[model samples]
Target chain A: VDNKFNKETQEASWEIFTLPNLNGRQVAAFISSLLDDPSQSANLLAEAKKLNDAQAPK
Target chain B: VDNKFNKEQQNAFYEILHLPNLNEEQRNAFIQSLKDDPSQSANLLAEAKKLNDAQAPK
Candidate 1:
């Protein structure tokens, strides 16, 4: 399955599932999982930050 | 730093990170970094899977 966004609309373009729900705790877990390996995760975070900066409103 | 994603978020995260600036080797390194930490990465992958499944066309 693929999840895509409409760049023009800035909204999700596909229907999303309702089960295995995403909640605060789940999000935390997902984040923690990524952070388990600090070096690699740090790189990912840095890359992500660059994206955020590029998208930031001027 | 708090690197995380919550429900109902939108951004060109992957798209930006997958930019041309990052060569194939660097991309591979990122993948390898995730693979190096399977347990946590697996959880992250599972969460990502759910998100993808949720957003896929029905």
Candidate 2:
């Protein structure tokens, strides 16, 4: 009875970016565009994958 | 030659919640509080830690 079995759960993670190269306005615009369209999600996912893969420690 | 040594890698992960118990106003307030002050981040981290510790499988 202890396991409060929440079976219908979705798992996702967030990545916080500190892109100093990008100004706050640019960041806000990018975020808005990403949210305003669904296709941009895949683009972002691909970009993140590349960054995560390339930047991973040796 | 394999390691191009970007030693400034930051590792972080995000957690999402679907709080059916929390109304939209309550959720907005919580998010606003977190964004308005950096101190709220610690409070959130503590809350997350408690949930993670409690719900983790045995």
Candidate 3:
């Protein structure tokens, strides 16, 4: 594909930030927060929170 | 798409800046340049130079 950005870095970011076994969602939220996009931040936070809840001791 | 970053903003950053249509290798190089690890600034500068070259009138 005619990708305009580095695929490895972007893919690494995706891999690390979306890994189901880790805090991928929260990390994504943090990145979005740093970028100053609150809507995404909130959405990511919600998704992370849901994951957190699901993973919590039940 | 489970994209973490804003697609529109990323697209603007790529298209408006006229960055080179890079693939994974270049993307990894660019991202590595932004790290706080040793020689990061230099790497970033190198990546910037590459982009500048691609940006020049062709």
Candidate 4:
């Protein structure tokens, strides 16, 4: 998990998720939902985390 | 100072102290010095701010 933390995009935007199996579109959709509804941002973040945990399994 | 925010670096690690006049070497040197002397880091940071205010003239 510590090693996974180092994986990041060189660009300012776009972070490399350990959930590499997840499509980029999926990640983008999650971020878009967050921006569109600031109130639901925390839920969106949690959902992203759930996806990561479910997909990465570590 | 509000406009001077968001120069570069995040994560509570490295920071842009509104010191654009400082070169990359100067910035890196200050960071390295802080790492070497954790106890003196605060003083070092203040010195960096002084340098910034001096060079930026604000």
Candidate 5:
């Protein structure tokens, strides 16, 4: 479904889905709102993962 | 799906879904990926409509 995104974006997106906490949904939604802010014109993929790694199961 | 979130978190969530330019199948996929509760699913499904209305024809 998210194949709409490029590889890196897809990876970032998958990272969202795979984040440690359940808060990923809200984070995704916030970034998604910003997608609307960019209005499909733009990191978006690159920019979306403002939070990561620590989100991992270290 | 987000039983962990406060009302404010849910609002940001719904607004993102409400405001984004997302494909229906794509958006639906995102919505359903969230599980573990029936009631929250209902709310997300409802929130999806605002986005659909915002960008439905495609």
Candidate 6:
């Protein structure tokens, strides 16, 4: 689905899915977080992924 | 990012990215294939994802 909630969240979801590295649930968390802040999604997914990866866990 | 190659390719890329279940490379294949004959992208991403999944994995 391109947009489950709104166009912004759809973009967030898209960005999250495209990263070569993130697993499904990790990507879900990123999109879920975006729900709290609506318009931050234009290029925000990669940054969120970076932060999650830097935390460094299995 | 929305229209990098052109407005059409951009929408194709954008549509390709929004599917929640597709991993990076499968999605990449969809967009890469689109370059051969563009404008199939008004709403092509989900259908392509479906076809890819139905083919059964290796």
- Complex DockQ per candidate: 0.05, 0.09, 0.04, 0.02, 0.08, 0.10
Report the lDDT tens digits of candidate 3 across residue range B1-58: 2234344424422332233444334444443323222234344545655765674665
lDDT of 2 by residue, B1-32 (tens): 21121222211112212333333233333333
Task: Compare the candidates by lDDT and give the number of the best one.
Answer: 6
| CA lDDT for candidate 3 | 0.40
CAPRI level of candidate 1:
incorrect
> Which is the winner by TM-score between candidate 1 and candidate 5?
5
DockQ of candidate 6 (2 decimals):
0.10
Task: Give all candidates' CA lDDT scores.
Answer: 0.31, 0.34, 0.40, 0.42, 0.44, 0.55
**TM-scores of all models?**
0.22, 0.28, 0.26, 0.35, 0.34, 0.35
Per-residue lDDT of model 5, residues B1-58, tens digit only: 4455445444433443443356534563544444233345556656665656666565
Cα deviation of B25 in candidate 3 (Å)?
Answer: 7.7
iRMS of candidate 5, Å: 9.3
lDDT of 4 by residue, B1-58 (tens): 1211122312211332224555434544554444344444456667776776676744
Better of 1 and 6 by DockQ: 6
The superposed Cα distance between candidate 3 and the true structure at residue A47, in angstroms, equals 8.0
* TM-score: model 3 vs. ground truth: 0.26
Give the Å error, residue B55, model 4. Answer: 1.3
Residue A32 in candidate 6 has what lDDT? 51
RMSD of 3: 11.7
Candidate with best DockQ = 6
In candidate 1, list every pair of residues with a backbone clash.
A16-B54, A17-B54
Q: Give the C-alpha miss distance for residue B16 in model 5, angstroms.
A: 8.8
Task: Tell me the tens digit of each residue's lDDT in model 2 across A1-58.
Answer: 1121122111111221333333223333333333333345456534544555565553
Clashing pairs in 4: none
Rank list by lDDT: 6, 5, 4, 3, 2, 1
For residues A1-58, what per-residue lDDT tens digits would candidate 4 score against the true structure? Answer: 1121121211111221223434434554554443335456557666766776687746
